C-alpha cells in the first residue's frame, strides 16, 4: 500500500475540528440545612455536565449518520455557542435554572465533541495519521485545560473578570470552525458508503491525501462497505447482539470505564491537597498545577508521536501500569508521609508519574481506538456505547467517590489500583495492535478472536 502524508488541507481540517470542538471542550471542563442544600445543589450542578455528555453521546449516531461528521461538529458548535449566548442573556437576566440548562447544553457539547472529533479525524486521515490525528483532539483538550487555568489566573492578576476577552476567546474557535471548516472535505468514507457518492469521496480523498489516484483506498473503503453490508444498520442493541463485535464492545466498555474509574478527578482536585501536604504555597500550588498542565500537554504531543511509532496497545499498557504503580506507591506514600517527612515529596513525584502515565495510554487512546476497532456503520453506535460508559462512569465516580474517600481515606486509591491492574491484564490478553492496519484487517483479527 502507498503511505499517506500530512497535507495542508488535512492539517488545517484537523486543526479546525480539534481546536473548535476539542479545545472548547478542554477549555470548558475547567469552566464547568443550608450546608446540606449546598452539597446537594453543588452535586446536582456538577452532575448536569456528565449527564449532558451522556445525552450527547446518545445522540451522536443520529447526527453523524445524517449530517455527517462535519455536520455533527457544527451541531456541536451550536450546542457550544448557545450556552455563551445564554451567558450574554445571563448578563441581561440570570437564574440558577438557566445555569443548570447551560451546564446541560455544555455537557451535550462535551460528549458530542469528544466522540465525533476522533471519529472525523479517524475517517479523514490515513491509518498512520489516523493514529496521530486520533490523539490530537486530546492534545487540544490538554491545551485547553492549560490555557484555561493559566489565562484564568492571568485574568485574576489583571482584573476580576475578563468578559470581553473571555467571550472573544470562546467565540474564536467556534467562529473559525464555522467559517472555515464547512469548506473542508467531509469524511470520504461517509461520502462513498453512507452518502453513496463516489465522485465526492474521490475528490475529498484527492484533496486530503494530496494525490490524483485514490483508487486503492476507495476500493478498500468499498471492502469495508461490503463487510458492513452483511451487518446492516447495526443499532446499539443489535451491536450488543453481535458476536463479531462482541470482544470489541467489551474492549471499548472496559477501556472507557477503566479510564474514568482510574481516579483521574480525585487526582485533579486533591492535587492541591497533596501540595498542601507538602506545604506548598497557594501561589506555588497554582504554579505546580500549571506545571502539571504543561507535563500533560507536552507528554500528549509525545503521546501523539509515540502513539504512532510504538502503537496503541503498548501505550495503553505503559499508561495503565504506570498509573497502577502510581496508585499503590501513592497509598504507601500517604501512609508514610504522616510518619516521615521525606515521603510526601516522593508522593509528589509519583503523582507526576501518574499524570504522565494517564496522559499517555488511558486518556487519548481509547476514543481513536473506538474509531479504529469498529467499521463504518458500527462505529457511531459503538461511540454511543463507549461514550455512555465514559460519562456514566464519570458520573458514578463523581457522586460515589466522596463517600468512599471520606470513609476509607487513602485506601480509596487502592480500588483504583485494582481497576488499573485488571484493566492492564485485559489489555494484555485482549487488545491487538491496530497501528498501520486497515479497519478491515483489525476487524478480521477481532472476528478471528470472536469465532474461536
Amino acid at each position: 500500500e502507498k503511505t499517506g502524508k500530512l497535507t495542508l488541507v488535512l492539517a488545517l481540517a484537523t486543526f479546525l475540528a480539534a481546536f473548535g470542538s476539542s479545545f472548547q471542550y478542554g477549555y470548558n471542563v475547567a469552566a464547568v440545612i443550608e450546608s446540606f442544600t449546598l452539597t446537594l445543589l453543588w452535586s446536582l450542578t456538577v452532575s448536569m455536565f456528565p449527564f449532558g455528555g451522556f445525552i450527547g453521546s446518545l445522540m451522536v449516531g443520529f447526527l453523524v449518520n445524517n449530517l455527517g461528521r462535519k455536520g455533527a461538529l457544527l451541531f456541536n458548535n451550536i450546542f457550544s455557542i448557545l450556552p455563551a449566548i445564554l451567558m450574554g442573556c445571563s448578563k441581561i437576566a440570570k437564574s440558577f435554572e438557566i445555569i443548570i440548562a447551560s451546564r446541560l447544553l455544555v455537557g451535550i457539547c462535551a460528549g458530542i465533541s469528544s466522540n465525533v472529533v476522533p471519529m472525523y479525524l479517524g475517517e479523514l486521515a490515513p491509518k498512520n495519521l489516523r493514529g496521530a490525528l486520533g490523539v490530537v483532539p486530546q492534545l487540544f483538550i490538554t491545551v485547553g485545560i492549560l490555557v484555561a487555568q493559566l489565562f484564568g489566573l492571568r485574568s485574576v492578576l489583571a482584573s476580576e473578570e475578563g468578559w470581553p476577552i473571555l467571550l472573544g476567546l470562546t467565540g474564536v474557535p467556534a467562529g473559525l470552525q464555522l467559517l472555515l471548516l464547512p469548506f473542508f472535505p467531509e469524511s470520504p468514507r461517509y461520502l462513498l458508503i453512507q452518502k453513496k457518492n463516489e465522485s465526492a469521496a474521490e475528490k475529498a480523498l484527492q484533496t486530503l491525501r494530496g494525490w490524483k489516484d485514490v483508487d486503492m483506498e476507495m476500493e478498500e473503503i468499498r471492502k469495508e462497505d461490503e463487510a458492513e453490508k452483511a451487518a446492516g444498520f447495526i443499532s446499539v442493541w443489535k451491536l450488543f447482539r453481535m458476536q463479531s463485535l462482541r470482544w470489541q464492545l467489551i474492549s471499548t466498555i472496559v477501556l472507557m470505564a477503566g479510564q474514568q474509574l482510574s481516579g483521574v478527578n480525585a487526582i485533579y482536585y486533591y492535587a492541591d491537597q497533596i501540595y498542601l501536604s507538602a506545604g506548598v504555597k497557594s501561589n506555588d500550588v497554582q504554579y505546580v498545577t500549571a506545571g502539571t498542565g504543561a507535563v500533560n500537554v507536552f507528554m500528549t504531543m509525545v503521546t501523539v508521536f509515540v502513539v504512532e511509532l510504538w502503537g496503541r496497545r503498548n501505550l495503553l499498557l505503559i499508561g495503565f501500569s504506570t498509573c497502577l504503580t502510581a496508585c499503590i506507591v501513592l497509598t504507601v506514600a500517604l501512609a508514610l508521609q504522616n510518619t516521615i517527612s521525606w515521603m510526601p515529596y516522593v508522593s509528589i513525584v509519583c503523582v507526576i508519574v501518574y499524570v504522565i502515565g494517564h496522559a499517555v495510554g488511558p486518556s487519548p487512546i481509547p476514543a481513536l481506538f473506538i474509531t479504529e476497532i469498529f467499521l463504518q456503520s458500527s462505529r457511531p453506535s459503538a461511540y454511543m456505547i463507549g461514550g455512555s460508559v465514559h460519562w456514566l462512569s464519570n458520573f458514578i465516580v463523581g457522586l460515589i467517590f466522596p463517600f468512599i474517600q471520606v470513609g476509607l481515606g487513602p485506601y480509596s486509591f487502592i480500588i483504583f489500583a485494582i481497576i488499573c491492574l485488571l484493566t492492564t491484564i485485559y489489555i494484555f490478553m485482549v487488545v491487538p495492535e491496530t497501528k498501520g492496519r486497515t479497519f478491515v484487517e483489525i476487524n478480521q483479527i477481532f472476528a478471528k478472536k470472536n469465532k474461536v
Epitope: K5, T207, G210, W211, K212, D213, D215, M216, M218, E219
Partner: antibody, heavy 119, light 115 residues
C-alpha cells in the same frame, strides 16, 4: 531495477487496427496510474491517454476520443492500448509511462514501440 | 472543447557549456488542479532516447536530478532554470500539465550547444 517494455507495434494501413501492450516489472504495478504518450517523426511529445490504478479513471487526448481505448490488467501487470480506425496523423512512437502517486508525474518511461500507418 | 495549451519559449536555445539557461512555459488558462496542487512538470529527452522526469509540482526536483536544475513559476507563468549547462543536459525539454484533461505537452524547446 524498474522496467517497462512495450510491444505490439509495427506497420498498419490507414483505417486499420492495432493493439499495443506494456509489460511492467520491479514495482507494485497496481499501486500506480499509467499513461500513454506519443511522438510523431520530427515532432514534439503528444499526450495520448491515462488510466488510474484501478481503471476507475480513464482519460483521452482530443485527437483520439472515440477512436482509442485504454485498458489495464493489474494481476497480469500489463497496460494496453487498443487502437482502431488508424490514420496517417497517428504514425508515431508510443511510450507507456508510470504514474508515480506521491508526485503524480511520469517518473518512468518504456523504450517505446513504433507504429507506422501508411500504404 | 476544453484545450489547455502549453507554450514553451524559445523554440531553440544555443548555449556554451557552463552557461546559465532559462526556458519558459505558459498555459492558456490557470493549471491549478482541484486538489490544490499545480501539476506543471519538466521532462528531458535526448536523441534516440526515452524522456525522463526532471521536475514535478512546479519546483520539486525528481530523484536523481542534479541541483543545477531548478523549477519556478506561479499561476499561468512557469520557468525551468539551469544554473550551468553541462554536456549531458543537451536535448529537448518539454513542459507538461497533468491538472486538466486532456493532458498536454508543450511544443518543446531544443537546448543545444553553440557551433
Amino acid at each position: 531495477e524498474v522496467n517497462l517494455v512495450e510491444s505490439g507495434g509495427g506497420l498498419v494501413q490507414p483505417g486499420g487496427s492495432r493493439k499495443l501492450s506494456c509489460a511492467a516489472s520491479g514495482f507494485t504495478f497496481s499501486s500506480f496510474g499509467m499513461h500513454w504518450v506519443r511522438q510523431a517523426p520530427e515532432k514534439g511529445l503528444e499526450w495520448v491517454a491515462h488510466i488510474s490504478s484501478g481503471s476507475r479513471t480513464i482519460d483521452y487526448a482530443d485527437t483520439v476520443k472515440g477512436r482509442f481505448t485504454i485498458s489495464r490488467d493489474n494481476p497480469k501487470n500489463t497496460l494496453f492500448l487498443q487502437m482502431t480506425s488508424l490514420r496517417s496523423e497517428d504514425t508515431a512512437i508510443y511510450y507507456c509511462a508510470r504514474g508515480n502517486g506521491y508526485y503524480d508525474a511520469l517518473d518512468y518511461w518504456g523504450q517505446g514501440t513504433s507504429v507506422t500507418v501508411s500504404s | 472543447e476544453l484545450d489547455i495549451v502549453l507554450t514553451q519559449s524559445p523554440l531553440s536555445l544555443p548555449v556554451s557549456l557552463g552557461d546559465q539557461a532559462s526556458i519558459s512555459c505558459r498555459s492558456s488558462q490557470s493549471i491549478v488542479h482541484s486538489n490544490g496542487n499545480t501539476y506543471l512538470e519538466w521532462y528531458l529527452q535526448k536523441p534516440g532516447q526515452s524522456p525522463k522526469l526532471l521536475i514535478y509540482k512546479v519546483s520539486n526536483r525528481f530523484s536523481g536530478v542534479p541541483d543545477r536544475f531548478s523549477g519556478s513559476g506561479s499561476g499561468t507563468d512557469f520557468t525551468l532554470k539551469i544554473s550551468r549547462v553541462e554536456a549531458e543536459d543537451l536535448g529537448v525539454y518539454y513542459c507538461f500539465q497533468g491538472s486538466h484533461v486532456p493532458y498536454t505537452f508543450g511544443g518543446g524547446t531544443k537546448l543545444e550547444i553553440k557551433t
